[PDB]
């Protein structure tokens, strides 16, 4: 997260870290047994880390649970990141508490201009590199589809939306991928892709979760 702020420990209780010996992507807890992330975060050997603030220090509220199954969206296209969504089942149910909590799925898509909360442990610099150990947060509005598609002609599908600031300065970044965009209490986006981080006229691109709620619900109920 570039241009954001330290969230505060466990203030984003649905945020998970995906760990394969190291943090490599975010995710969102949607019930005690399932996490939603980005398909481009797929790998085998995932451990889900819940209750995290400092990902390098055991602070006392963590739950570390191995993934038992990963399900990449059937239509994920790795060249274009169209349908950049994946489900991860936990080998054992998380113990839900005030620091380890699910986020609701949308019942409808969110409209342009709605303010959202984006969070993660990604790079915090727009030139160069600095990775935080505590969770970072950013408030950012959903941008119009026209502004999104103007920034990335040819590359935005109906399964994507842009959020952030055309002036630059404030964006998600490498290492935030797979993490949440929460708007009005609903998981509306997944950190997916962009051009650099926090550059002028190149807002972040997010998987449009409202298009996937039927697939999510049917998939989890059958697995
Ligand atoms: N600035 C950001 N908000 C952001 C967030 C996550 C990742 C990120 O950058 C990485 C760099 O490599 C990946 C992801 O962003 C770009 C590329 O994926 C795509 C996706 C869709 C189309 C194509 C394409 N070039 N045709 C590339 C930045
Ligand atoms: Ca920790």
From Swiss-Prot:
Source organism, top-level taxon: Eukaryota
Peptidase S1 domain span: 1-221
Keywords, ordered alphabetically: Calcium, Digestion, Disulfide bond, Hydrolase, Metal-binding, Protease, Secreted, Serine protease, Signal, Zymogen
GO CC field: extracellular space; serine protease inhibitor complex
EC numbers on record: 3.4.21.4
Keyword match Phosphoprotein: no
One Pfam family matching this protein: Trypsin
InterPro entries named in the record: Peptidase_S1_PA, Peptidase_S1_PA_chymotrypsin, Peptidase_S1A, Serine_Proteases_S1, Trypsin_dom, TRYPSIN_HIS, TRYPSIN_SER
Subcellular location: Secreted, Extracellular space
Modifications made to the protein after synthesis: Subsequent cleavage after Lys-125 leads to alpha-trypsin. Further cleavage after Lys-170 yields pseudotrypsin. A cleavage may also occur after Arg-99.
Any Gene Ontology biological process: proteolysis
Cofactor binding annotation: Binds 1 Ca(2+) ion per subunit.
A GO molecular-function descriptor: metal ion binding
Chain sites annotated for binding Ca(2+): 52, 54, 57, 62
Broad EC category: hydrolase
Substrates-to-products reaction catalysed: Preferential cleavage: Arg-|-Xaa, Lys-|-Xaa
Cofactor needs: Ca(2+)
Active site: 40 (charge relay system), 84 (charge relay system), 177 (charge relay system)
Protein family membership: Belongs to the peptidase S1 family.
Protein name from the UniProt record: Serine protease 1
